């Protein structure tokens, strides 16, 4: 799967690590995290992540 980058801060999502401490586990694609996810290195939501395009 491909990892997401939050525009606002840099964090990149890495769908093999997932966000366990915040619910998604690891294995879990960016569309598939819940919608109320927010990064957990500054707070926006997901509508800020741009998809990392290899
Ligand atoms: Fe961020």
Same mark, same amino acid.
């Given at each position: 799967?491909?990892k997401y980058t939050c525009t ?8 093999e690590d997932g966000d366990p =401490?915040?619910?998604?586990?690891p294995g879990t694609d960016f /569309? *598939?995290?819940?919608? =109320? ?8 939501? /997901? *509508? ?7």
């Amino acid at each position: 799967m491909k990892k997401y980058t939050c525009t606002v801060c840099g964090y990149i999502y890495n769908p093999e690590d997932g966000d366990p =401490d915040n619910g998604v586990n690891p294995g879990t694609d960016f /569309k *598939d995290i819940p919608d =109320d996810w927010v990064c957990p290195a500054c707070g926006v939501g /997901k *509508d800020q992540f741009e998809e990392v395009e290899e």
